[PDB]
DNA sequence: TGCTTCGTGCCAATAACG
DNA sequence: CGTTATTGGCACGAAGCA
């Protein structure tokens, strides 16, 4: 037992018992709760670091390999993560990649074995 | 104050089951 | 191998940090 619920205007929110963060999804509360319980460990397969969420380890491991999955479509430069790509496109191209038009391509991950999304 | 990492709704892909 | 149950990839704003 790791949560209680709160219902406001007919909307259900799941509240973590330890820190009282609220979640629209019970799956998000569970993913978050590992930060408290450390029931599940996600150790980096290249260094000593251990993370409480799978996605923190994955994004960390890409720094080890150096794969540059985020490609600017305006000039072709590639970047290790969304933030570098977004900042490049905003400052060099004066355009916002968030939604609207598709200014970048996310290539599949080939330097690690992670789940493969067919839309890439 | 610009890099660095975190965080969470959404949901597709993979794990689990026996 | 057939479904479903669960994980975790992703965006991109938030937070951390020097
Ligand atoms: Cl690359
Ligand atoms: Na968001
Ligand atoms: Zn919590
Ligand atoms: Zn590492
Ligand atoms: Zn560019």
């Amino acid at each position: 037992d790791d949560h209680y619920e709160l219902i406001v205007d007919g909307r259900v929110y799941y509240i973590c018992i330890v820190c009282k963060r609220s979640y629209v999804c019970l799956t998000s509360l569970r993913r978050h709760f590992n930060i408290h319980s450390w029931e599940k460990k996600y150790p980096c397969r290249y260094c000593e670091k251990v993370f409480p969420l799978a996605e923190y380890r994955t994004k960390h491991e890409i720094h080890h390999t150096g794969e540059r999955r985020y490609q600017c479509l305006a000039c072709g430069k590639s970047f290790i993560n969304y933030q570098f790509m977004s900042s490049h496109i905003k400052s060099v191209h004066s355009q916002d990649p968030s939604g609207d038009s598709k200014l970048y391509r996310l290539h599949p991950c080939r330097s690690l074995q992670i789940r493969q999304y067919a839309y890439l």
Side-chain angles (χ1 to χ4, degrees):
Chain A
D1 164 42
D2 64 336
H3 81 277
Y4 58 97
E5 327 166 11
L6 168 138
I7 301 171
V8 195
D9 308 40
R11 281 137 26 210
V12 174
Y13 297 97
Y14 304 91
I15 318 300
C16 170
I17 40 171
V18 166
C19 63
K20 292 121 152 202
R21 292 191 172 71
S22 59
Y23 294 95
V24 170
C25 308
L26 195 55
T27 54
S28 296
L29 188 146
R30 304 258 192 265
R31 169 176 59 183
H32 153 83
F33 199 82
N34 205 62
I35 296 173
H36 304 306
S37 63
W38 279 101
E39 223 206 333
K40 273 176 176 170
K41 319 251 181 177
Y42 303 95
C44 175
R45 67 170 305 174
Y46 306 96
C47 79
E48 297 285 47
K49 294 165 118 307
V50 179
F51 303 85
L53 271 71
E55 82 187 21
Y56 301 168
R57 170 181 61 181
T58 296
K59 284 202 279 184
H60 168 76
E61 284 176 338
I62 274 190
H63 277 73
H64 281 299
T65 69
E67 192 184 358
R68 288 166 163 149
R69 298 178 62 197
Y70 285 83
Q71 181 163 36
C72 167
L73 293 187
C75 75
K77 289 187 188 198
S78 307
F79 300 94
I80 65 171
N81 63 30
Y82 182 105
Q83 281 85 4
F84 279 114
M85 169 284 299
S86 178
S87 163
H88 162 84
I89 296 185
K90 287 181 175 178
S91 58
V92 175
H93 299 303
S94 287
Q95 284 164 278
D96 198 322
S98 57
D100 222 294
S101 45
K102 214 172 148 170
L103 309 179
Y104 72 103
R105 170 178 273 120
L106 180 52
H107 296 281
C109 185
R110 61 185 181 191
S111 76
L112 315 154
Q113 297 106 53
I114 71 174
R115 186 178 51 218
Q116 297 294 308
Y117 275 106
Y119 81 91
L120 300 168

